[PDB]
Amino acid sequence: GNIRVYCRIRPALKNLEDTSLINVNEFDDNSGVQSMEVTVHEFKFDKIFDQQDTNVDVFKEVGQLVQSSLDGYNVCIFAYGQTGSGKTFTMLNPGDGIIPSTISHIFNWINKLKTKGWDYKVNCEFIEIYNENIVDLLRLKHEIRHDQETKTTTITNVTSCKLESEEMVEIILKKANKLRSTHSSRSHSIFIIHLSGSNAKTGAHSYGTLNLVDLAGSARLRETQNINKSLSCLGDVIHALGQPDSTKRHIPFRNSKLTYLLQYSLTGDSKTLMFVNISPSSSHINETLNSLRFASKVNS
Amino acid sequence: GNIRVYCRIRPALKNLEDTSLINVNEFDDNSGVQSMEVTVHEFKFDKIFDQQDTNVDVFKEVGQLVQSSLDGYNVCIFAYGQTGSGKTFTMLNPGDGIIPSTISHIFNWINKLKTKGWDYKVNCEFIEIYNENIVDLLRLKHEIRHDQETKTTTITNVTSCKLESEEMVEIILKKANKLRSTHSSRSHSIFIIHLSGSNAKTGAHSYGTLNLVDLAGSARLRETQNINKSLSCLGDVIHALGQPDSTKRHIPFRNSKLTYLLQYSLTGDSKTLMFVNISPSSSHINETLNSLRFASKVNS
Ligand SMILES: Nc1ncnc2c1ncn2[C@@H]1O[C@H](COP(=O)(O)OP(=O)(O)O)[C@@H](O)[C@H]1O
Ligand SMILES: Nc1ncnc2c1ncn2[C@@H]1O[C@H](COP(=O)(O)OP(=O)(O)O)[C@@H](O)[C@H]1O
Numbered sequence A, B: 001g002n003i004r005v006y007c008r009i010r011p012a013l014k015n016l017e018d019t020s021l022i023n024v025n026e027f028d029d030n031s032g033v034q035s036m037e038v039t040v041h042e043f044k045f046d047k048i049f050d051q052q053d054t055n056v057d058v059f060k061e062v063g064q065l066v067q068s069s070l071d072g073y074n075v076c077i078f079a080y081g082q083t084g085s086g087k088t089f090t091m092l093n094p095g096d097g098i099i100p101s102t103i104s105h106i107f108n109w110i111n112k113l114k115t116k117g118w119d120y121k122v123n124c125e126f127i128e129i130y131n132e133n134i135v136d137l138l139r140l141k142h143e144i145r146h147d148q149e150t151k152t153t154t155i156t157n158v159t160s161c162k163l164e165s166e167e168m169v170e171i172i173l174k175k176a177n178k179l180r181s182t183h184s185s186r187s188h189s190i191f192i193i194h195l196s197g198s199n200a201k202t203g204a205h206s207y208g209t210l211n212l213v214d215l216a217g218s219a220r221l222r223e224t225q226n227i228n229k230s231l232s233c234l235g236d237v238i239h240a241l242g243q244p245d246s247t248k249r250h251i252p253f254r255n256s257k258l259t260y261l262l263q264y265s266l267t268g269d270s271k272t273l274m275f276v277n278i279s280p281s282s283s284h285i286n287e288t289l290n291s292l293r294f295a296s297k298v299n300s
């Protein structure tokens, strides 16, 4: 049930961006942290990624927990931060992004698990939380329907694609990126993978979920009060969960369609990862401090 | 593993159609049959339906076996016969058709089963076999993939919709009819319902399938040699199955993408129903004799 938070700077661009006050301190693998100072403000996520680090680098860290799902664990990955800061890239960049890398890492792990009596079934769903209203990105009423027993969570009338072939993954993925690149800015996209694997050998029925979330523009209709509502809620929910006496603390899971949606892949034995995508361009140090300040506090 | 065949006349129309040589003999519930003579040729399905009988009438007979799926049984329903003879009506006529009536009858049976500790899960798929090439009517590679163990049968990359709400059934159904009414003539549409219901009480895991098939125009590209290929194959497969020493007889299930597709919901403990939709218009007595002759022989 561990929470981790990583910062993630990206390289400047040609539209805007200059210099850099974003001093990324060297990763201190003793305290296990990794500070960084903006100008001077201090922050220290669970590992920082400067523009130099690539998706592969980023996923090599993550890959670790994401394979837990195959262990029936649940996982949440969040790409938070002002718009244009990279959230969709980190998540869906073709071949590279966390989602593409997850379906792969997971895929490979299974092929190699089959050989161990095991065997897995995989289906997923892609939806989006725009204005607290779930939309089915893979295709009405879509209400989060929980199962207090299995601790599962469905969503009514939501397309759930069987990730059977890589051709599918290809389509879905392709489609997912055409969708979140350049709306996608003012919403929360969510890729959900359901690892359901039996195993004749030990009959160890195993189920687990991964929720790869691309939060909406934390940047500074009235979906605006909304985005700040969800994002802030998530903040409070993560925080509250990453709190010592929290098992006994009252978390407002239902105070937002998102958190409520992933409340099960957010509790008990769950894995949550917050990615604070920030830009190095001094022309965003204002909205950047905010992002680093979101995580910094949320991670306690 | 019983096979039944019903004829099904429909009322004439304004485009064509006159009189009637289609003498429908009275249902003889002793021999259990029901002859009928065309002019004089004799035929005797498992019950005939003249234009007077409605979808409700037709389904009240069928409804019987279709509830078997809830008993883990598998079912196949075929609407065969020259084009314009009613196949799509019998199957998808709004609210009335066999498919709409099945999702209902099944739906009601479950609500009433839940109350008996039971509980069911339902998903379906709608695809079409046009030119031996499976198309996903609910949305690449679609290969029939069998499971010699569970006796199940998937179809790669094929959309499988969770029949969760009646809103969905509504959409799917609506969409299904826009699709097969006035192409749909030169193909085989197939609605597949998967009744998967556990039950905490007796933990009796139960799975069953229903395949509601709208065969292509048996009427008299080169999809033509194809349609005659599939239809004829199905003929031979039904026949061969409805044969005494058939358990020991070699059935060419794979000699057609359709039969091969439903080979499991066609054998062992399966329920197959053939519907020979014919017109009363003397202006089709030629292509009609053929239909009645298809069933007549196939049913032995
Ligand atoms: N890690 C990265 N490496 C290279 N370019 C990046 C990276 N992250 C973001 N970008 C670029 O920044 C721009 C913003 O894209 P996007 O990921 O959608 O940002 P955001 O999701 O924050 O709005 C894109 O042109 C993208 O290619
Ligand atoms: N049982 C029936 N009652 C009333 N009309 C029918 C019936 N069966 C078919 N029809 C009519 O016949 C026409 C042919 O429709 P369709 O069912 O698609 O036939 P087919 O599937 O054989 O091509 C339609 O206009 C339909 O409404």
Ligand SMILES: [Mg+2]
Binding pocket: A084, A087, A088, A180, A181, A184, A185
């Ligand atoms: Mg974006």
Ligand SMILES: [Mg+2]
Binding pocket: B084, B087, B088, B180, B181, B184, B185
């Ligand atoms: Mg038709």
